[PDB]
Design a protein around this ligand. Structure first.
Ligand SMILES: CCCCCCCC/C=C\CCCCCCCC(=O)OC[C@H](COP(=O)(O)OCC[N+](C)(C)C)OC(=O)CCCCCCC/C=C\CCCCCCCC
Ligand SMILES: CCCCCCCC/C=C\CCCCCCCC(=O)OC[C@H](COP(=O)(O)OCC[N+](C)(C)C)OC(=O)CCCCCCC/C=C\CCCCCCCC
Ligand SMILES: CCCCCCCC/C=C\CCCCCCCC(=O)OC[C@H](COP(=O)(O)OCC[N+](C)(C)C)OC(=O)CCCCCCC/C=C\CCCCCCCC
Ligand SMILES: CCCCCCCC/C=C\CCCCCCCC(=O)OC[C@H](COP(=O)(O)OCC[N+](C)(C)C)OC(=O)CCCCCCC/C=C\CCCCCCCC
Ligand SMILES: CCCCCCCC/C=C\CCCCCCCC(=O)OC[C@H](COP(=O)(O)OCC[N+](C)(C)C)OC(=O)CCCCCCC/C=C\CCCCCCCC
Ligand SMILES: CCCCCCCC/C=C\CCCCCCCC(=O)OC[C@H](COP(=O)(O)OCC[N+](C)(C)C)OC(=O)CCCCCCC/C=C\CCCCCCCC
Ligand SMILES: CCCCCCCC/C=C\CCCCCCCC(=O)OC[C@H](COP(=O)(O)OCC[N+](C)(C)C)OC(=O)CCCCCCC/C=C\CCCCCCCC
Ligand SMILES: CCCCCCCC/C=C\CCCCCCCC(=O)OC[C@H](COP(=O)(O)OCC[N+](C)(C)C)OC(=O)CCCCCCC/C=C\CCCCCCCC
Ligand SMILES: CCCCCCCC/C=C\CCCCCCCC(=O)OC[C@H](COP(=O)(O)OCC[N+](C)(C)C)OC(=O)CCCCCCC/C=C\CCCCCCCC
Ligand SMILES: CCCCCCCC/C=C\CCCCCCCC(=O)OC[C@H](COP(=O)(O)OCC[N+](C)(C)C)OC(=O)CCCCCCC/C=C\CCCCCCCC
Ligand SMILES: CC(C)CCC[C@@H](C)[C@H]1CC[C@H]2[C@@H]3CC=C4C[C@@H](O)CC[C@]4(C)[C@H]3CC[C@]12C
Ligand SMILES: CC(C)CCC[C@@H](C)[C@H]1CC[C@H]2[C@@H]3CC=C4C[C@@H](O)CC[C@]4(C)[C@H]3CC[C@]12C
Ligand SMILES: CC(C)CCC[C@@H](C)[C@H]1CC[C@H]2[C@@H]3CC=C4C[C@@H](O)CC[C@]4(C)[C@H]3CC[C@]12C
Ligand SMILES: [K+]
Lengths: 49, 294, 244, 40, 294, 40
């Protein structure tokens, strides 16, 4: 149940800011760095353990 | 000096500043004091959230209960003429104020009053100090129980012919269980006869050894005819959990009182969680200076 | 969960406001994989608060483990304060070196430009590329330390769900050890030589470490008053809205 | 001051790192003490 | 499920709550976030009160000054064809942007400009870093000083016939006094001739030993004809205390440059408070990759 | 609890006074130490 909620806010923030990055003129090597930062930020890499 | 520092007309100053200075200072003080008030109020609200409505957190300053009476004496003295009626009016108005709360009309129905044993009995626990069960129920205390001092027969209560009464009362304490002395070989002289365990004894005497002879017959009236308080009226659950609660009372008639002479009468209750104090002359006992001058 | 907001917000402002990157990705991994593990592990050693063997069994179709109340607390309130504290320390570090808050909005395009060796600050000084990057990294280090500072009060307000701290008590030795280790690790990662070659974390000046303290105390006071109305008003708003 | 105001551009990061490490070490020890205090 | 949790018509709920719930939650979040914003703003205002307007508290991240240039190279490379004009346009537009600030029309009157020694001189202290005296005065720097690279004669500045120019510049630092190397037996080879104490020397060379031969005659232009920066333009008092301030510049013409081949030219300044860094390739020195392919 | 709930009306003022005096004494000493620290 919570991996479902966590993933919800992760894709909502990701697909949206990726479209935003190119709506503002960001090149590809910058948007990739963004995407990464946002995915890591949302996932609690240490919880399950 | 005198005139200028009050009002000059070149700089348009009053007392020293112009209109914009008095306005900036006033605005600053208003904002400052407003913040001060809001902070004090917030710190007091958190305090209202830190206390309980059904029980006082600290109950140590009221551990040994007091012993008050019905008449209001200025210096613990009862002095009145048996001829002049306007002499014992201040007393009767009080006695009456106290007994006026035990009127039967007030005590009626099943709620919230309950009929209890006409003879002294044991404690009664109506649960904990919670709001789960609604308003608890208190035992009924009839006026008539007090026989010659009830204001139902002789409104004056005694003061009319040299035989005053004194309604004693035990100070109401939340969760306080009265504990009387047991029947063992150590017990005062007085208490031996009529040891109803369920009764807290009250016994009056004379302060000095001389006055004994001048004090006549102390006639006590109470629940069951005993000179004490029935344990069934305890404990007290507090105003919030027991509004319409009546505390027992004990009447004392000082019949055969010598005329034209100051008599010092000390009344005292006996019991385990009862302790007196050499500083507080109302903790457990009480003193009265009666003088029926006629 | 609470620490996710202070890690998500720097990125979001990076795109909406165009300010220099506040929290890198390596710093994040150093927060979720480092300083937060031991405290989270210690939260298991917590004793009971009331009587558990007295309540009825939990309903599977209605009561869950992660409801919306928790999201409203971690993602909505505590995490927000932690993010604000991090941004505070950020702006402080940049304002002390010469970049005032009014000149930071709009600078990213040139702040990241690798070929602009002359970036004017609020006072008129010219900063090369590597010089401004060193400051951004020091801002990442202080942001991470601010996270630890606010996590102190978060671990204390998370210790108990209803009861007060002055009632339960700090008898959990593991939690105390977690706080001490959590602080020692941050100091070690910043002060050890050669950490600018491996993790990109520069030393901090003793006056910065105190920029997150007020936010932490505020978090503690807010949650303390929160866990109070619940005790006095059973079934009210604070309970059906913030009681996990 | 004046021309030789070179100190206005120097900071003793060395001493700062030394102290910060001493402190980190102390906190780490205290931690261990608390952790093992009871198992002896 | 799908439909109900979206809109039911018995309880008049949307997404799960009624209109009064969404309203209480929204009002709470608005008040909470409002308080959060006000607190952050207050803590930022005290910060504005903690800093000075005439000087940066910390100046250690900018101690060794940089060495930038006029052309904007993407990878520190200057590659252009002597035939196709649309090849060196991105360069000229920059060079021009830089020199367009030294126009004489801008530098006029007594305020705030002052005529200084046409020959290198010593430092000039216009007092402390205060507001007591008004806006300080900065020395004038004429365009024409740069002889063949000024865009006044050959707008293109050189790029038209295989002889590009490179305007070097020292990074502006507040209160920074440049200190050149003294005449003692230890000094680089190059620096011995023309030791004007008052001039900070700039000298370019080839990165590799091979490239020496392929680089022709480095002709520098500057104040007084020397290859450096006059000490009289220092120190810098900051934007607030010296708006309309011009920093010296040094032009470098790379005449006799081999055609169709990448040349790595490293320029370097020499001095006491000047130190290079193996990580920052712009601290004190700079690198350029010129290739005049035609 | 119940009838014998007498503890609900007792407070150990003795122990409180003892501790408060120990503390006062300590603070007084520390004070003297600071005052004379330098004159020796
Ligand atoms: C120049 C020096 C000035 C010095 C200031 C001295 C401050 C004290 C001044 C007057 C004190 C008056 C007594 C205060 C009591 C107010 C009563 C009140 O208000 O009872 C309403 C609520 C209580 O509700 P309840 O029914 O739940 O309680 C019990 C519920 N039961 C019992 C049923 C369970 O009390 C509340 O909410 C909280 C209200 C607490 C009252 C604070 C009001 C203070 C007003 C101004 C102070 C600001 C001073 C700034 C300096 C100005 C200089 C010009
Ligand atoms: C401006 C700066 C803002 C900073 C904001 C963040 C603050 C977060 C850090 C610390 C907050 C400290 C809060 C203090 C709370 C004290 C509560 C307390 O004292 O409640 C007393 C309890 C209750 O006892 P009872 O009646 O149940 O006992 C019954 C015993 N029977 C059963 C035998 C009868 O007693 C007990 O818990 C037992 C004794 C426990 C003693 C604990 C002492 C350690 C306290 C803190 C450790 C320091 C952490 C520092 C982290 C920084 C690392 C660099
Ligand atoms: C209850 C159990 C308790 C256990 C506690 C364990 C605590 C352990 C405490 C200390 C061990 C730390 C490791 C020692 C590292 C020595 C590194 C060193 O001596 O470096 C010296 C040289 C620096 O030379 P330079 O100044 O000329 O460089 C100039 C560079 N310029 C000029 C280009 C900027 O290094 C270099 O060059 C290259 C630098 C290489 C980077 C190595 C750092 C490792 C990175 C991450 C590992 C840390 C993980 C945290 C583990 C926590 C355990 C609790
Ligand atoms: C409670 C337990 C506490 C202990 C946990 C430790 C806390 C930290 C936890 C996770 C940190 C992971 C973050 C990964 C960061 C990698 C950074 C990185 O890769 O930056 C790339 C650099 C760039 O170098 P360059 O090419 O410019 O150098 C040129 C040298 N020239 C030119 C002089 C020759 O490369 C380098 O630094 C090369 C060195 C690579 C560094 C690897 C560090 C791995 C760190 C942690 C992994 C182990 C954690 C296990 C503990 C789990 C706890 C549950
Ligand atoms: C219950 C839980 C207990 C937890 C206890 C944890 C133990 C704490 C362990 C150590 C803390 C003490 C640290 C002392 C370090 C001083 C070292 C020092 O020499 O440092 C000087 C700096 C000034 O640096 P600068 O930039 O001016 O010069 C830089 C000049 N260069 C760079 C050119 C050299 O100063 C500084 O770092 C200032 C250092 C910070 C000052 C300590 C503040 C304490 C705050 C609150 C405690 C209040 C307790 C009240 C008692 C209540 C009793 C009931
Ligand atoms: C509920 C929330 C709790 C929050 C707790 C926060 C604790 C913060 C702990 C330490 C504060 C940071 C240390 C500050 C060090 C600053 C060093 C410095 O370089 O300072 C200089 C500036 C003044 O510069 P200027 O331009 O005016 O100089 C003009 C000079 N001329 C006139 C010659 C031109 O100083 C200034 O700004 C000083 C202004 C600071 C005002 C903020 C006061 C902070 C409040 C409490 C501090 C904690 C102490 C008590 C601890 C109790 C423990 C229970
Ligand atoms: C209850 C009682 C407890 C008592 C416990 C006592 C413990 C023992 C006492 C002290 C132990 C601390 C060790 C002190 C070592 C200091 C090393 C140091 O100060 O080095 C500084 C310099 C590097 O300066 P830089 O110029 O490159 O700066 C950069 C400048 N820029 C970037 C601007 C160009 O060092 C260098 O050059 C050479 C560095 C060589 C490698 C040294 C290895 C140190 C690494 C780890 C040891 C620390 C572990 C502490 C325990 C933590 C547990 C979590
Ligand atoms: C969901 C997570 C939200 C996270 C919040 C992140 C906060 C940061 C967000 C955006 C940052 C934008 C940059 C801020 C700078 C504003 C500039 C400004 O304003 O410059 C006006 C004055 C400065 O005046 P000056 O000319 O004297 O300075 C210099 C004078 N010289 C240079 C001539 C000497 O600055 C002032 O007064 C103080 C103004 C400081 C700006 C604070 C504004 C923040 C706005 C909302 C934050 C509240 C967030 C609550 C959570 C909401 C969630 C929905
Ligand atoms: C820089 C300036 C330094 C100044 C230092 C001054 C030295 C201070 C000297 C002594 C203070 C320690 C006092 C400890 C006394 C504990 C004694 C005790 O057994 O007491 C128990 C009471 C609980 O009483 P009850 O009514 O529950 O039971 C009554 C039960 N019957 C009455 C039936 C028996 O508890 C209490 O009195 C609680 C005692 C108060 C708790 C201490 C709180 C400390 C506050 C702030 C300091 C934080 C420092 C953080 C470190 C930062 C480092 C950088
Ligand atoms: C750096 C290291 C520093 C170390 C310094 C160590 C100093 C030496 C160590 C300890 C010295 C402290 C002395 C402790 C004496 C405790 C006396 C005590 O606990 O007595 C309590 C009882 C009275 O209780 P009660 O039942 O009447 O309560 C009233 C109950 N109600 C009112 C409800 C009915 O005592 C009685 O009966 C009998 C009392 C007989 C008279 C005792 C005289 C004590 C007076 C002053 C000595 C304190 C000076 C401390 C220094 C301060 C410097 C400013
Ligand atoms: C930083 C400072 C200036 C903030 C001060 C905020 C003040 C104005 C706030 C803090 C707590 C608030 C009070 C807290 C509790 C109550 C009880 C409630 O039933 C009505 C509102 C009332 C009476 C509030 C009125 C406004 C109040 C006193
Ligand atoms: C306890 C909490 C809720 C109080 C928060 C108070 C907030 C709203 C107060 C505190 C400090 C205040 C600011 C402090 C400084 C300035 C600069 C001034 O030139 C205009 C007002 C302005 C912009 C204030 C606006 C309101 C403000 C942010
Ligand atoms: C420098 C500052 C922050 C230190 C402040 C120290 C304060 C908090 C200290 C100083 C004196 C202390 C009190 C002194 C005396 C007593 C009586 C004792 O029976 C219990 C502790 C108690 C109640 C102490 C509690 C904490 C106290 C008030
Ligand atoms: K994360």
């Amino acid at each position: 149940h919570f991996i479902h909620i966590i993933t919800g806010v992760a894709v909502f923030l990701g697909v949206s800011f990726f479209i935003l990055s190119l709506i503002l003129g960001y090149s590809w090597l910058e948007a990739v760095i963004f995407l990464i930062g946002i995915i890591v930020a949302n996932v609690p890499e240490g919880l399950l353990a | 000096g005198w005139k200028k520092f009050l009002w000059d007309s070149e700089k348009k100053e009053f007392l020293g500043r112009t209109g914009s200075s008095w306005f900036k200072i006033f605005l600053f003080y208003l904002i400052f004091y407003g913040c001060l008030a809001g902070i004090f109020i917030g710190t007091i609200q958190v305090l209202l959230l830190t206390l309980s409505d059904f029980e006082p957190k600290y109950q140590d300053r009221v551990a040994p209960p007091g012993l008050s009476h019905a008449p209001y004496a200025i210096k613990t003295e009862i002095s009145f003429s048996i001829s002049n009626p306007k002499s014992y009016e201040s007393f009767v108005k009080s006695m009456h104020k106290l007994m006026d709360l035990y009127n039967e009309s007030s005590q009626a129905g099943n709620s919230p009053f309950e009929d209890c044993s006409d003879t002294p009995a044991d404690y009664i626990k109506r649960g904990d100090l919670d709001d789960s069960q609604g308003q608890k129920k208190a035992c009924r205390f009839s006026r008539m129980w007090l026989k010659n001092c009830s204001g139902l027969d002789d409104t004056t209560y005694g003061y009319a012919e040299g035989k005053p009464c004194v309604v004693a009362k035990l100070n109401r304490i939340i969760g306080f269980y009265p504990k009387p002395l047991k029947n063992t070989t150590d017990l005062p002289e007085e208490l031996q006869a009529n040891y109803n365990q369920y009764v807290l004894p009250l016994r009056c005497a004379a302060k000095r050894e001389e006055d004994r002879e001048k004090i006549g017959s102390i006639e006590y009236f109470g629940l069951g005819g005993y000179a004490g308080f029935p344990l069934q009226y305890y404990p007290y659950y507090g105003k919030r959990l027991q509004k319409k609660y009546l505390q027992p009372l004990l009447a004392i008639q000082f019949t055969n009182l010598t005329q034209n002479m100051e008599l010092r009468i000390e009344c005292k209750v006996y019991g385990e969680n009862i302790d007196y104090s050499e500083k507080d002359r109302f903790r457990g006992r009480f003193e009265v200076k009666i003088e029926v001058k006629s | 969960l609470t620490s996710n907001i202070p890690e998500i917000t720097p990125f979001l402002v990076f795109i909406i406001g165009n300010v220099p990157l506040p929290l890198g990705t390596v710093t994040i991994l150093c927060i979720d994989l480092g300083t937060d593990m031991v405290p989270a592990i210690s939260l298991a050693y917590e004793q009971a608060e009331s009587d558990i063997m007295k309540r009825q069994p939990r309903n599977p179709k209605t009561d869950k483990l992660v409801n919306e109340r928790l999201i409203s607390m971690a993602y909505g309130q505590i995490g927000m304060i932690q993010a604000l504290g991090g941004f505070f320390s950020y702006f402080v570090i940049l304002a002390e070196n010469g970049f005032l808050p009014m000149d930071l909005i709009g600078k990213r395009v040139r702040w990241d430009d690798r070929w602009i060796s002359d970036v004017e600050d609020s006072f008129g000084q010219q900063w090369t590329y590597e010089q401004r990057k060193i400051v951004e990294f020091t801002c990442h280090t202080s942001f991470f330390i601010s996270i630890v500072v606010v996590q102190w009060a978060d671990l204390i307000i998370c210790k108990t769900r209803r009861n007060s701290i002055f009632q339960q008590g700090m008898k959990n030795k593991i939690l105390i050890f977690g706080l001490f280790e959590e602080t020692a690790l941050a100091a070690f990662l910043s002060y050890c030589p050669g950490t600018d070659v491996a993790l990109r974390m520069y030393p901090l000046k003793p006056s910065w470490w105190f920029c997150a303290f007020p936010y932490s105390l505020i978090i503690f006071l807010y949650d303390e008053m929160r866990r109070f109305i619940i005790r006095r008003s059973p079934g009210g708003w604070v309970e059906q809205e913030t009681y996990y | 001051e004046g021309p030789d105001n070179d100190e206005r551009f120097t900071y003793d990061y060395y001493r700062l790192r030394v102290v910060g490490l001493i402190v980190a070490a102390v906190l780490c020890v205290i931690g261990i003490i608390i952790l093992l205090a009871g198992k002896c």
